Amino acid sequence: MSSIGTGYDLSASTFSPDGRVFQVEYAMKAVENSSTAIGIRCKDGVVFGVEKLVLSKLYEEGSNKRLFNVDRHVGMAVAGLLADARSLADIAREEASNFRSNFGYNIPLKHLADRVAMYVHAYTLYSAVRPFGCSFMLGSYSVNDGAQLYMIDPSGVSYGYWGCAIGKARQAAKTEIEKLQMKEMTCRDVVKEVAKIIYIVHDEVKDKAFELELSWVGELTKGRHEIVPKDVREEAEKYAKESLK
């Protein structure tokens, strides 16, 4: 990049000789430093999985929320710095909340991903506010497209994914998703499998323990978005530990 003493990396309404702002790139490192969020598109729903690091042994699930329920059919799984994740969560919740209430049907995702990414990007343009140093995914079950999963980067670029991972081992996680067929597989089986990828990522010589938050929006819940039921949640983690060894 550059480390010029006036602007370019110290502002973000200033483009480099090539046309890029260094400030968004510094932010892009931030998703890499902490734990992964995986999310794969099914066709009966979407299954999300974020490993929440047990930093303190005096926490309970619902602490350092990486998993948000955006609406009652829309999820958001984030990776990277949690403060920029919260902002992104707040905007997403309001955008989803007006659409169910008013229209009366489930939100087609592809527009939603574009709007939120517009929000990210509008802030990048400005030098008065910051690029968002989070990468996040949105997932929904719709009656106009079925399941959709889109991943939006800290740059405000939106692409749809059959199966994504954003986090501290994208390369290892994406590849495991490639091998498996989860693209059009049933949500129930997927729960176990998403957890199992989280198990590979996690180390018992870089992490102590994590608490699994998965989120359903699929056939068990009848398309309702809830954070994983305690029985199911446990079952899926139980499989993850047992199958490696």
Binding site: M118, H121, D153, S155, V157
Partner: peptide, 12 residues
């Protein structure tokens, strides 16, 4: 051009 800028112009 740049895809970051692409999504944002289209929504405008």
């Amino acid at each position: 051009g740049m895809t970051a800028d692409s999504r944002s112009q289209v929504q405008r």
